[PDB]
From Swiss-Prot:
Belongs to the BI1 family. The chain crosses the membrane at residues 11-32, 40-54, 62-81, 91-112, 118-141, 147-170, 181-202. This is pH-sensitive calcium channel. Keywords: Calcium, Calcium transport, Cell membrane, Ion transport, Membrane, Transmembrane, Transmembrane helix, Transport. Changing E44Q: Causes a large disruption to the gating mechanism and thus allows a large amount of Ca(2+) influx in a ER-like lipid environment. It comes from Bacillus subtilis (strain 168). The record marks D166 as: Important for activity. Calcium channel that probably plays a role in the regulation of calcium homeostasis. Uptakes calcium ions and mediates calcium flux in proteoliposomes in a pH-dependent manner. When expressed in E.coli in the presence of high extracellular calcium concentrations, shows calcium-leak activity, increasing intracellular calcium concentration. It can also mediate Ca(2+) flux from the endoplamic reticulum (ER) when expressed in permeabilized mammalian cells. Calcium transport activity is also detected in ER-like lipid vesicles. Monomer. Residues 33-39, 82-90, 142-146, 203-207 are extracellular. Its main location: membrane.
Length: 207
């Protein structure tokens, strides 16, 4: 008979582990040749769909989440190498550090506060819709410095709020032990998205 404390603890452990794994994948990524990046990104989107938007009998398991962390780490390499090339590695490290303390603080606040933040879920989803939209727009019509910078500020705010919300709902919602992997996956996505936004912002700012 698990308790909520143990469930949250296990979720956070898996989260940390996905961080380490994604880091291994990121390291691995510097030897991954281009054109494999496309099918890997495709696999990434398909896995996101299978895990979140597809009414399945059984929820996503540990193998799924850890594999995703690996591949995701690999695929965030061009982003990292790019911004490191124009801003330097220390900026990447500082962005990771920033993401880290933001996640720790906002996560602790979300998890330990008594209010139920289950009302802004629609607002948050809407925000993510916007960010994804301008993100796709960026592919066909690349944004300038100021624009990408603004997009990064908004992204930062949004995903920070999403971290707060997610830990809050992990505390408040009825989370069974079979949802542990997909919750940890959610925290991973929060982290990675915040990180990409911060890295983009400071990376551009330092060039």
């Amino acid at each position: 008979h698990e308790s909520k404390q143990s469930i949250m603890q296990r979720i956070l452990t898996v989260f940390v582990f996905t961080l380490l794994i994604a880091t291994v994948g990121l390291f691995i990524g510097q030897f991954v040749p281009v054109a494999l990046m496309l099918p890997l990104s495709i696999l990434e989107v398909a896995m996101i769909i299978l895990a979140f938007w597809m009414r399945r009998r059984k929820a996503v398991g540990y193998a799924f989440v850890y594999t995703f962390a690996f591949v995701s780490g690999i695929t965030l390499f061009p982003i990292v190498s790019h911004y490191a090339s124009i801003a330097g590695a220390y900026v990447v490290l500082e962005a990771f550090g920033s993401t880290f303390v933001i996640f720790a603080v906002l996560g602790t606040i979300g998890a330990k506060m008594k209010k139920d933040l289950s009302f802004l879920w629609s607002f948050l989803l809407v925000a993510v819709l916007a960010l994804a939209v301008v993100g796709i727009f960026n592919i066909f019509s690349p944004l300038n410095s100021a624009a990408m910078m603004a997009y990064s500020v908004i992204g930062t705010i949004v995903f920070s709020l999403y971290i707060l919300y997610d830990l809050n709902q992990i505390k408040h919602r009825h989370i069974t032990e079979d949802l542990i992997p997909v919750m940890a996956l959610s925290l991973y996505l929060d982290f990675i998205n915040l990180f990409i936004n911060l890295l983009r912002f400071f990376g551009i700012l330092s060039s």
